[PDB]
Design a protein around this ligand. Structure first.
Ligand SMILES: OC[C@H]1O[C@H](O)[C@@H](O)[C@@H](O)[C@@H]1O
Ligand SMILES: [Ca+2]
Length: 251
C-alpha cells in the first residue's frame, strides 16, 4: 500500500517548485539516482514559485536569425544550425540562456534542476498510470508518504528514497526517449504526496507529464483540481495514513 495523508491545514491549489543550480553541460550529475532523489538539495537554491498547476516543461532555446530572435522547437533545428522557417541561427546552442519560461521564474532554463512537490487528490479509487511522454534531460516522479515526502511535511528537506514511480534519462547526445509509465493504486479522497525532480543540462528542456485515471480519462499538462499544497504542520497528529484501505475512518 502507498502511504497517503490527511492534512488538516488550509489547502492551496497547485504545486510548489523549487529551483536548484545545475552546471551547464554537466553530463554526469543529471543521470545519477541519488542526485535526482535528494542530492539536488545540496546545490544552491535559486528560488521558488508556488501554486503551479500546469507542470509540463517545454523549453526551446532561441534562434537568433536575420529577422529576429525566436524560440526554435527542437524538431525544427537542423544543420549547424538553423531552424526551419527562420534560416541559419547565429547563436550557440551550448551557452546558458536566461528567461522566465519555467513558471515565470527568471533563471537559466538551459541548466537547472527543479523540484516540484504537492499532494495528488484522486477522485476515483483504482489504478492511475502516470506518464512522461519523453524526457530531456532527466526526471523522476515519486508518489507516497514513504517515497515522495512525509505527510504534513511538504517543505522539509528531501527524503532519501530512490524508489521512483517513474524515472527517465535521455542518454547524452542520444535521441529523446520513448514514453515512460508507472502505475499506482490510489484511494479516493486521500492526499498522496507527489514529487517530480527534473534536470536540464544544456539547451532544450522537455517533460510532458500526464496521468490516466482508473476510468480511462487522461489529464495532460495541467493538473488543476488534482494537485494541492499545504504548509507544513509537524504537530498534526493524525496526518499520516499508512494504509488507506484499512484506515479507521472517524467522522
Ligand atoms: O542529450 C544531451 C543533449 O542533446 C542535444 O544537444 C539536445 O537534445 C539537448 O537538449 C540535450 O541536453
Ligand atoms: Ca537538454
Amino acid at each position: 500500500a502507498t502511504e497517503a495523508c490527511l492534512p488538516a491545514g488550509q489547502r492551496k491549489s497547485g504545486m510548489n517548485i523549487n529551483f536548484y543550480q545545475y552546471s551547464l553541460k554537466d553530463s554526469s550529475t543529471y543521470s545519477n539516482a541519488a542526485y535526482m532523489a535528494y542530492g539536488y538539495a545540496s546545490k544552491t537554491k535559486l528560488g521558488s514559485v508556488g501554486g503551479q498547476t500546469d507542470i509540463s516543461i517545454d523549453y526551446n532555446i532561441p534562434c537568433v536569425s536575420s529577422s529576429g530572435t525566436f524560440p526554435c522547437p527542437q524538431e525544427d533545428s537542423y544543420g549547424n544550425w538553423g531552424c526551419k522557417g527562420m534560416g541559419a541561427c547565429s547563436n550557440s546552442q551550448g551557452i546558458a540562456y536566461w528567461s522566465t519560461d519555467l513558471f515565470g521564474f527568471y533563471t537559466t532554463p538551459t541548466n537547472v534542476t527543479l523540484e516540484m512537490t504537492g499532494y495528488f487528490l484522486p477522485p476515483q479509487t483504482g489504478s492511475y498510470t502516470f506518464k512522461f511522454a519523453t524526457v530531456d534531460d532527466s526526471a523522476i516522479l515519486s508518489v507516497g508518504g514513504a517515497t515522495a515526502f512525509n505527510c504534513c511535511a511538504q517543505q522539509q528537506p528531501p527524503i532519501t528514497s530512490t524508489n521512483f514511480t517513474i524515472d527517465g534519462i535521455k542518454p547524452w547526445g542520444g535521441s529523446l526517449p520513448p514514453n515512460i509509465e508507472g502505475t499506482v493504486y490510489m484511494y479516493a479522497g486521500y492526499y498522496y504526496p507527489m514529487k517530480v525532480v527534473y534536470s536540464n543540462a544544456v539547451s532544450w528542456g522537455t517533460l510532458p507529464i500526464s496521468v490516466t485515471l482508473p476510468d480511462g480519462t487522461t489529464v495532460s499538462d495541467d493538473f488543476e483540481g488534482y494537485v494541492y499544497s499545504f504548509d507544513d504542520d509537524l504537530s498534526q497528529s493524525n496526518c499520516t495514513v499508512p494504509d488507506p484501505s484499512n484506515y479507521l475512518e472517524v467522522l
